[PDB]
Design a protein around this ligand. Structure first.
Ligand SMILES: *Cc1c(COP(=O)(O)O)cnc(C)c1O
Ligand SMILES: *Cc1c(COP(=O)(O)O)cnc(C)c1O
Ligand SMILES: [Cl-]
Ligand SMILES: [Cl-]
Ligand SMILES: [Cl-]
Ligand SMILES: [Mg+2]
Lengths: 386, 386
């Protein structure tokens, strides 16, 4: 199959990504664009190949966490609009314009000072901007309709800026109680109505994350922001249970057994702390993944991997680079056998969602903390590359 | 002051690393060498520059998790011996000899097949090998005297290989009960005098990790493997409290406030889940760090940062890229102010070790999971460089 020195790797199924984009496309209104959210290295799936695939199969724009993530995509030959969701220091204004990155901003002072930096360097390449309106996320963005007006005016007065969007972020659209979500929607529409009544024409409006796209597709407006769903993962249990859109998981994480041994002699202590004592004929397979790869140490004596289609448990503590599992009394297994850490094997499955449940977190965290040291392979039209 | 687009960075104090190395050197026997452990991107501090500094200031070899980690060091100009502590596939044997990386092995069959690959290439480089003995870690390594002996003869007979060392690993040396650690010591020594009685001359003998170097410096033999200590962190509260060796923590994690706001208008909800509701005169600051950087989401309504010399609470949930914090009623804080996330500022400190206690994990995980997206800056002779 694949040749590696250390035998741990991720497979991202781009056929799955395409199918997710199509399922979402067919769910939200026909005219709505998709902005594929490829922040944090593609939610740990690899920003570039996900971005490239997304753009060919129904996305129009990309979103990222920073200018540096956006430049990564440029250097990969990507020319679609890239929006930085977080805050960008005035330090990087010039660099942003040069690499044609779209920045979010929401403050008069920032817009004017951005304009002055660009006026000095004199480039014809204007800096693209979106305005973030905070309707209750409480994170970034402007909060009253009157400060919003000033921001718009300052942006429109700035000839080295170009306004290409305005947005908000829902903070509870994945929850069974939709009260807050509807209050946010109705505040955002409100602020926009206010702008329209001052004779201001709107650029691209966008508010839905995956959760709201699915539960409130009527909010898609000109463009949705598809993150977790792109990766074939649901924003919550609730959203999944609505059974409105069929997503398929794009990531699996795999490895090969590095060493197998029957624990014939003493001491039969396994791993740091000696927290697991194996039986005399207990078989113990060692695997090349650990907590510095993003495989939580809280999975010590708790997690489960797949080997020849069955669940075999983590025995003893997770270490920095390796774990051990029990194949049981006289269990069969060889050096080189393929193991799935996240995903499917035969008819068994250990989803990223089950892993997040074990660890009292969410699927976003389990994928987006997968270390860059784990190489990514991509599957397209059923076959593997770079 | 540092310029960045997104204002989050690590500083690694190489003056601290030099002192830790000195403190360890002065505590273990004069003739013992130090192998600096820089696996996992230097325990998230950056392997290249820690390794570079270490080799100028007490270390004479390095250890890594994998061939690929070793090749990163070699490309940066590093020439010292580099040991792979984990298992390496026979597919990487020609490569490892080309780049002069030292491989761990402990299997007769592996020895022969590696010799055989080189033999075919008429290789003029000999691949350097260390033998892992498993004395109770139960991870990797050979477990009996008798298997040990055959492994040695295979390797001695394999003339495109070169035996340059032999080790074991302690699994409990950071615990107040030393019983198992003394049994592993004793078992290792017995395995090694068993070899000597067949007239086998031994290469470099190494057993101690940071914990064993500090509590059992008499076990240093020819070489120790200094990991966590090199970074200025103790392996456990017990080891620290022994008060034997003073270590200085090398890493701090910083950011600048992306935005500061007073929560005047409704709704006053902060972050995903609306789990925190601010007071009307309460100041919320947003920071450009979140769980994809390795800032655990389990800090959501729990973590602390330092700002102007004091402890300010995380408010609401950690997000993928950003956290929010409370500067309290009528706050005092601006955009651009510097915040310490891990580390010290004026009176105050939030140590890696206290973050680890809160998350019920260990300092190793806390630093080794710091994402590569956070740029690392180094301090050397009081001054800063990238
Ligand atoms: C990351 C992000 C998204 C995409 O969210 P999902 O829950 O992944 O669909 C949307 N909007 C903002 C403001 C974000 O930071
Ligand atoms: C990482 C590692 C070390 C060093 O351990 P610290 O607790 O970091 O000093 C030693 N030996 C082996 C076999 C390792 O994998
Ligand atoms: Cl936001
Ligand atoms: Cl990483
Ligand atoms: Cl080991
Ligand atoms: Mg983690």
């Amino acid at each position: 199959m694949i040749k590696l020195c250390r035998e741990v790797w991720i497979e991202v199924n781009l056929d799955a990504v395409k199918k997710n984009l199509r399922a979402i496309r067919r769910h939200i209104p026909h005219k709505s664009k998709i902005m594929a959210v490829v922040k944090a290295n593609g939610y740990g799936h690899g920003s570039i190949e996900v971005a490239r695939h997304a753009l060919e199969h129904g996305a129009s724009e990309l979103a990222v966490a920073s200018v540096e993530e956006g430049i990564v995509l440029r250097k990969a030959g990507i020319t679609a609009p890239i929006l930085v969701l977080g805050f960008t220091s005035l330090s990087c204004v010039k660099k942003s314009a040069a690499w044609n990155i779209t920045l979010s901003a929401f403050q008069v002072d920032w817009m004017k000072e951005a304009n002055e930096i660009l006026e000095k360097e004199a480039s014809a390449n204007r800096l693209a901007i979106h305005i973030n309106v905070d309707t209750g996320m409480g994170r970034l963005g402007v909060r009253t309709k009157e400060e919003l007006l000033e921001v718009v005016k300052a942006l429109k007065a700035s000839k080295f800026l170009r306004w290409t969007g305005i947005f908000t972020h829902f903070s509870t659209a994945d929850e069974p109680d939709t009260t807050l979500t509807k209050l946010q929607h109705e505040k955002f529409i409100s602020f926009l109505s206010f702008l329209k009544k001052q004779g201001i024409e709107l650029p691209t409006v966008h508010m839905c994350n995956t959760a709201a796209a699915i539960a409130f597709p009527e909010f898609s407006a000109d463009m949705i922001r598809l993150g977790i769903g792109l990766y074939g993962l649901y924003p919550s249990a609730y959203i999944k249970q609505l059974n409105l859109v069929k997503l398929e998981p794009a990531l699996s994480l795999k490895a090969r057994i590095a060493y197998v041994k029957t624990m014939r002699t003493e001491p039969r202590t396994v791993s740091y702390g000696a927290t697991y004592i194996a039986e005399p004929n207990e078989v113990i397979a060692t695997l090349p993944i650990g907590y510095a790869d993003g495989y939580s140490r809280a999975l010590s004596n708790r997690g489960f991997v797949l080997h020849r289609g069955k669940r075999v448990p983590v025995a003893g503590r997770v270490t920095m680079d390796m774990i051990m599992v029990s194949l049981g009394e006289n269990g069969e297994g060889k050096q080189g056998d393929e193991v799935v850490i996240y995903g499917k094997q035969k008819g068994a499955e250990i989803s990223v969602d089950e892993v997040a449940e074990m660890l009292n977190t969410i699927n976003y965290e389990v994928v987006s903390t997968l270390s860059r040291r784990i190489p990514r392979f991509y599957i397209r039209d059923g076959e593997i590359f770079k």
